[PDB]
Design an enzyme around this catalytic site. Structure first.
Site, mmCIF file in Angstrom:
data_model
loop_
_atom_site.group_PDB
_atom_site.id
_atom_site.type_symbol
_atom_site.label_atom_id
_atom_site.label_comp_id
_atom_site.label_asym_id
_atom_site.label_seq_id
_atom_site.Cartn_x
_atom_site.Cartn_y
_atom_site.Cartn_z
ATOM 1 N N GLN A 158 3.409 10.093 -28.654
ATOM 2 C CA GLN A 158 3.324 10.885 -29.866
ATOM 3 C C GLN A 158 4.206 12.104 -29.692
ATOM 4 O O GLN A 158 5.028 12.428 -30.551
ATOM 5 C CB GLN A 158 1.904 11.372 -29.955
ATOM 6 C CG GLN A 158 0.826 10.629 -30.562
ATOM 7 C CD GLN A 158 0.531 11.054 -31.965
ATOM 8 O OE1 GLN A 158 1.309 11.808 -32.577
ATOM 9 N NE2 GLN A 158 -0.748 10.870 -32.327
ATOM 10 N N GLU A 189 23.666 13.560 -7.548
ATOM 11 C CA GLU A 189 24.019 14.818 -6.899
ATOM 12 C C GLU A 189 22.958 15.876 -7.146
ATOM 13 O O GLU A 189 22.584 16.615 -6.230
ATOM 14 C CB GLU A 189 25.378 15.308 -7.397
ATOM 15 C CG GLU A 189 26.590 14.753 -6.660
ATOM 16 C CD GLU A 189 26.869 13.293 -6.945
ATOM 17 O OE1 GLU A 189 26.072 12.643 -7.651
ATOM 18 O OE2 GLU A 189 27.910 12.796 -6.464
#
Ligand SMILES: Nc1nc2c(ncn2[C@@H]2O[C@H](COP(=O)(O)OP(=O)(O)OP(=O)(O)O)[C@@H](O)[C@H]2O)c(=O)[nH]1
Ligand SMILES: Nc1nc2c(ncn2[C@@H]2O[C@H](COP(=O)(O)OP(=O)(O)OP(=O)(O)O)[C@@H](O)[C@H]2O)c(=O)[nH]1
EC number: 3.6.5.-
Lengths: 427, 438, 185, 178
Positions: free
Chosen positions: B11, B254
């Site tokens: 929701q 990274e």
């Protein structure tokens, strides 16, 4: 005849080489399409050191281009010269690097080494008599480090008879971006000192300082920085391709440059650099070229040798000159600082004289030297490695890869041995 | 190649995904028909969409995101909305029952019969996608339904695929605002279930969004519309890496690696400096210096923790637009010199840079300005643990008096879960101070 | 019809408590009825289909004859209460060859008949609430030696007391069945 | 085609892996105790199929059960025959290259293959016989793959194998006694 082969490894190596090859093609006047327009005989017959002929008179670069991120070389292709770069030469990678040295060092390369070796040995057969190869990458560059290690390692044994030039850009001392970067750098430098013969030293901070000093142009491109550095490497390669009484062999240089096997790192220097006013506010004479040439300001490689002494120096000078100017210049500088050099070897200056001047300007020169100006760099890397290895930060990744701390211990030990060697030799 | 898959659980996640995907189709100039103008961008799915959409030979973009719901009103509303032709019918996975905010209910009752369904969807997208670097999960800690559902699906995706990155995004519990006093209960359930499999979790808070909105966006009566626009702007900035090119290209892997030093604690926080009204931008100026100072200003973070009570470990700056590296390095050097900044001695370098050429464009019907230089600033610091201290002294009293645990005993679970979770969180705090101390 | 849905799990096609459960079930009423009335044993509403003739009155799936069924599961179960009357049903499927075929289970059937397009089977069974079980691949393999692939339609005739029709991949046990599947009297 | 819709419906539990630019795969349910008869040629239809991402599954799984399932191909061979020649008639360079590779692996996979294949050359060969010579980076030379196929074939095929291959192929040569 005698030839060299280029390697562009890592996300820098690719873009570096892009600038390099476009520059060389400009210098010899090949159109971006690939149909050379006859301007210079001697360059036409000398070009065969680096280029191979393709039907219709097309001169393919003998560079092997490697990386793992498609966008890098695809953008380079979109550049105005990828059409002269060959689809055969392009090798792509089945990973995002993660900038992980261990990943790029044991798993990903495990299945690429075969193919890349086959391609480069095909190139070796294409050539006839090699001096060796040259490579461009970064010591801190994750993919370039992690792969260059293995590839250079192999090439060493298959060809123990050839010069493996290494051109790795050196990162900023004050910023490293990557935090495991010191780990990666130490990892690399271990096998670097173990295998290599020639090592270059170049730093972004020095580039920025020079830009603000004389470039004076506010906003450059890192591509303009590459403009400069590729100009330098073009200068050092001018000797092989050109007539005039100079000795071109990089081995002829290295035998002079290296008193001892543990000497690998070399600091470039470049000749006249000019600003807006100075183009018409300056003249072109050997004394002023030499003065600027031997300036810590004009220095761009690692850091000021003002703290230390010079061990070996070698410069090439390009244009129409004579002997007497460089003779008097070396004698001068020798006398002006008979102090700042070492007794151990006197007369540490080696010179070369290239006749064919550059396109655009008359007089130029390049200089490469070994002085005690790397001690700051590797003391810094030592203290960084110790500072983040006292508690072993980020170690879980490299254990997951499957490495152990003893590797780090031995590598830093070798680095400290090099520290002691460099210290003792000059003092 | 370079793409990922997104899950929008809740929701709570449907509004935000709806607005976001609007924004993406917008910057790409995507017509609500499903196809382009005479301009040539359609094909087999290889161009800027190709990471997000899958525009088949039929010419219809297929966004690589699965929206899951349990309260059908919202999903049917958007089904009747504008982009339903874009949105695949059952990719909008809908359930007909509601968990009443209960983690146990949403983790045992409904999930079992729907987890196979969502697994089928994700595998039938995984076949067609090429590189799939990871997963972009929009959820919430106090999931009014998403909590247990997300936890179970996270379990299954971890166990089957322990190879790829997992990126989680959640609105963090408001420290002083709560609609439900069982929000600490189910939130700590979710956290303790995640930590041993959770890869990279990022949190956000709505109160500070409101505060920003009446600070420099000149809005005193905000709406989920602006909320979603700004959070989507953050995620758009992060996805511009895949979209366009730049001076350097960085990656989620990274970030995962270099942002966290040590396992468990993988919960950094965002910060976006250049928010300002259109007229303010019109008659003022932007540059790296002031935007860096602002993104380092204590009242410019979506979580109300004082940096002078915190200590800095990890940072990441991403620029988008036209900049140079000289001012970048100069400004970051000034930051390192600045003494009010307190990094740990562990990392003399503690930052990750990224640069992209492409200018941040503007959404029609937005409330931002016309920017030329943008930055996302993602940092992990020590000031966080005060929130968990708050939550634990909240939790322990209400657990000693064990208010309304009879609902839980009726649905059939026991107290050993809470038992373990309390000392698990306590272990997390103790980790935090032992890493804070040198 | 809904091929995109998941053959995994269980497929209740018709189930009595559905408010308006007759969409895809075309009705052919003739001298009969459709009624929706509680029982005594389950005391719950079930469907009642009766008529004077059984061929006149019959329910069928799908509602659109221009549409298929599109089902892979080879197991079928029907919940029926015997009413001491004359009932039958029909299923049509597509096979390994891509030729259509029908199965005709008729309670009256005195013999077993194999015709190149349709097979027949007698139905005899007990009274009260009982169950149907069948395997498409089983019967096609035995009779036509071909290999069941998919279903395309199904038709049901009158004289029947109806709770639910559902489909399954396999022979399921009695314990995984939900409570509404776990019938009790 | 039929196999593509068969899997788009779904009955094959096969997993995968993947990265930037390369190849890898996994699976969910093992093959040896599932089937090598009811699913082998249906999956082989993916060979004749040419469409992302289905060709990935085809090109690889065809190898996969070849390595993992030796002593079962024995009776399924006539069923295998059909999609082979269908793809051959499909007449695409890349497709037939993939075929040649996988068929090479097929013949070398196990024993008994050529001797049982005795009845089954006059349908596969002649189209290749005419493919002989229309034309190492990634093994792209059609003609080289063709001669490799004939080489790996004939010696393992038997005794009159070569003479019937010759009757197909007027150029064809011995790899045995010349
Ligand atoms: N040409 C170019 N190179 C840059 C620039 N900025 C930084 N570099 C550096 O060049 C380095 C080396 O690149 P690679 O050898 O390909 O590194 P890698 O193995 O791919 O992993 P990374 O170092 O994380 O990129 C990078 O680490 C960058 O730090 C730039 O603006 N232009
Ligand atoms: N992400 C998101 N958060 C919202 C929204 N509206 C309110 N919030 C805040 O985020 C929380 C929403 O979570 P829940 O109420 O558990 O949502 P749900 O579990 O999926 O079920 P619902 O009761 O239908 O909302 C609330 O406590 C609010 O503080 C919204 O539309 N999206």
């Amino acid at each position: 005849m005698r030839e060299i082969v280029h390697l562009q490894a890592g996300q820098c190596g690719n873009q570096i080489g892009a600038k390099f090859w476009e520059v060389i093609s400009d210098e010899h006047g090949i159109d971006p399409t690939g149909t050379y327009h006859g301007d210079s005989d001697l360059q036409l017959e000398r070009i065969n050191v680096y280029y191979n002929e393709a039907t219709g008179g097309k001169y393919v670069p003998r560079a092997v281009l490697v990386d793992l991120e498609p966008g890098t070389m695809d953008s380079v292709r979109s550049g105005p010269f990828g059409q002269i770069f060959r689809p055969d030469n392009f090798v792509f990678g089945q990973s995002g690097a993660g900038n992980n040295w261990a990943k790029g060092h044991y798993t990903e390369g495990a299945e690429l080494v075969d193919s890349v070796l086959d391609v480069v040995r095909k190139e070796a057969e294409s050539c006839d008599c090699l001096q060796g190869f040259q490579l461009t990458h970064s010591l801190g560059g994750g993919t370039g480090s992690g792969m260059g290690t293995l590839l250079i390692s192999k090439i060493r044994e298959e060809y123990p008879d050839r010069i493996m030039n290494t051109f790795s850009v050196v990162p900023s001392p004050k910023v490293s971006d990557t935090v495991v970067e010191p780990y990666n750098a130490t990892l690399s430098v271990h096998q670097l000192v173990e295998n290599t013969d020639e090592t270059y030293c170049i730093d972004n901070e020095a580039l920025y300082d020079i830009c603000f000093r004389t470039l004076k142009l506010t906003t450059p491109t890192y591509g303009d920085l590459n403009h400069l550095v590729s100009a330098t490497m073009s200068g050092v390669t001018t000797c092989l391709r050109f007539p005039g009484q100079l000795n071109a062999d990089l081995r002829k240089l290295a035998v002079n440059m290296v008193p001892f096997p543990r000497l690998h790192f070399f600091m470039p220097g470049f000749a006249p650099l000019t600003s807006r006013g100075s183009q018409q506010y300056r003249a072109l004479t050997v004394p002023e070229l030499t003065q600027q040439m031997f300036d810590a300001k004009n220095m761009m490689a690692a850091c000021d040798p003002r703290h230390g002494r010079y061990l070996t120096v070698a410069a090439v000078f390009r244009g129409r000159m004579s002997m007497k100017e460089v003779d008097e210049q070396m004698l001068n500088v020798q006398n002006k600082n008979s102090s700042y050099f070492v007794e151990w070897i006197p007369n540490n200056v080696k010179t070369a004289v290239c006749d064919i001047p550059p396109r655009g300007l008359k007089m130029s020169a390049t200089f490469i030297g070994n002085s005690t100006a790397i001690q700051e760099l590797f003391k810094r890397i030592s203290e960084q490695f110790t500072a983040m290895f006292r508690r072993k930060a980020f170690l879980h990744w490299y254990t997951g890869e499957g490495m152990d701390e003893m590797e780090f211990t031995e590598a830093e030990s070798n680095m400290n041995d090099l520290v002691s060697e460099y210290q003792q030799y000059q003092d | 190649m370079r793409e990922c898959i997104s899950i929008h659980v809740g929701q709570a996640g449907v509004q935000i995904g709806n607005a976001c995907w609007e924004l993406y189709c917008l910057e790409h100039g995507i017509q609500p028909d499903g196809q382009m103008p005479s301009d040539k961008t359609i094909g087999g799915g290889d161009d800027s969409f190709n990471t997000f959409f899958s525009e088949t030979g039929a010419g219809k973009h297929v966004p690589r995101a699965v929206f899951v719901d349990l309260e059908p009103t919202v999903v049917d509303e958007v089904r009747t909305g504008t982009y339903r032709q874009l949105f695949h019918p059952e990719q909008l996975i809908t359930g007909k029952e509601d968990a009443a905010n209960n983690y146990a209910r949403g983790h045992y009752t409904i999930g079992k019969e729907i987890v196979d369904l969502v697994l089928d969807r994700i595998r039938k997208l995984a076949d067609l996608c090429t590189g799939l670097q990871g997963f972009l999960i929009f959820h919430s800690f106090g999931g009014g339904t998403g909590s247990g559902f997300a936890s179970l699906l996270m379990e299954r995706l971890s166990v089957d695929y322990g190879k790829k990155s997992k990126l989680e995004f959640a609105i963090y519990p408001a420290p002083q605002v709560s609609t439900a006093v069982v929000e600490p209960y189910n939130s700590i359930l979710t956290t303790h279930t995640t930590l041993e499999h959770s890869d990279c979790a990022f949190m956000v808070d709505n109160e500070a969004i409101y505060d920003i909105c009446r600070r420099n966006l000149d809005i005193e009566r905000p709406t989920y519309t602006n909320l979603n626009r700004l959070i989507g702007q953050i995620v758009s900035s992060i996805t511009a890496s895949l979209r366009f090119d730049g001076a350097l290209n960085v990656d989620l892997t990274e970030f995962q690696t270099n942002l966290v030093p040590y396992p468990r604690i993988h919960f950094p926080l965002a910060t976006y400096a250049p928010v300002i009204s259109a007229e303010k931008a019109y008659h003022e100026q932007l540059s790296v210096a002031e935007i860096t100072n602002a993104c380092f200003e204590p009242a410019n973070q979506m979580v109300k923790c004082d940096p002078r009570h915190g200590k800095y470990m990890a940072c990441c700056m991403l620029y988008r637009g036209d900049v140079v590296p000289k001012d970048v390095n100069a400004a970051i050097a000034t930051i390192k010199t600045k003494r009010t900044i307190q990094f740990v001695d562990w990392c003399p370098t503690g930052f990750k840079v990224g640069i992209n050429y492409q200018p941040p464009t503007v959404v029609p019907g937005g409330d931002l300005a016309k920017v030329q230089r943008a930055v996302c600033m993602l940092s992990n610091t020590t000031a966080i643990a005060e929130a968990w201290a708050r939550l634990d002294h909240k939790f322990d009293l209400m657990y000693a008096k064990r208010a309304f645990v009879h609902w839980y005993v009726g649905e059939g679970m026991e107290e050993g879960e809470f038992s373990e979770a309390r000392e698990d969180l306590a272990a997390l705090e103790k980790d935090y101070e032992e890493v804070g101390v040198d | 019809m809904f091929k995109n849905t998941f053959q995994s799990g269980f497929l209740s096609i018709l189930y009595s408590i559905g408010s308006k459960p007759l969409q895809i079930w075309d009705k052919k009423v003739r001298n009969g009825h459709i009624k929706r009335i509680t029982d005594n044993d389950i005391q719950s509403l079930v469907l009642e289909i009766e008529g004077t003739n059984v061929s006149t009155t019959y329910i069928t799936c799908p509602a659109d004859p221009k549409k298929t069924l599109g089902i892979k599961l080879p197991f079928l179960v029907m919940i029926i209460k015997n009413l001491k009357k004359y009932f039958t049903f029909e299923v049509q499927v597509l096979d390994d060859k891509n030729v259509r075929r029908r199965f005709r289970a008729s309670n009256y059937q005195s013999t077993t008949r194999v015709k190149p397009f349709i097979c027949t089977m007698p139905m005899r069974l007990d009274d009260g609430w009982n169950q149907i079980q069948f395997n498409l691949s089983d019967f096609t393999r035995r009779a036509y030696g071909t290999n069941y692939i998919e279903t395309l339609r199904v038709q049901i005739h009158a004289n029947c007391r109806i709770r639910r029709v559902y489909f399954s991949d396999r022979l399921y046990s009695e314990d995984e069945l939900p409570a509404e599947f776990k019938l009790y009297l | 085609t039929t196999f593509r819709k068969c899997y788009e419906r779904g009955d094959f539990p096969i997993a995968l892996e993947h990265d930037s630019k390369g190849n890898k795969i996994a699976w969910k349910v093992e093959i040896e105790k599932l089937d090598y008869h009811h699913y082998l040629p249906l999956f082989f239809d993916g060979l004749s199929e040419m469409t992302f991402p289905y060709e990935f599954f085809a090109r690889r799984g065809i190898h996969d059960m070849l390595e993992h399932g030796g002593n079962k191909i024995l009776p399924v061979i006539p069923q295998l025959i059909i999609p082979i020649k269908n793809a051959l008639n499909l007449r695409n360079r890349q497709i037939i290259c993939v075929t040649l590779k996988v068929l090479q692996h097929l013949v070398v996979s196990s024993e008994m293959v050529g001797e049982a294949l005795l009845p089954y050359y006059r349908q596969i060969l002649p189209i290749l016989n005419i493919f002989k010579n229309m034309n190492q980076q990634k093994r792209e030379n059609i003609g080289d793959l063709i001669q490799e196929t004939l080489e790996a074939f004939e010696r393992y095929g038997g005794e009159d194998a070569f003479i019937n291959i010759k009757y197909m192929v007027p150029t064809y040569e011995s790899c045995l006694l010349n």
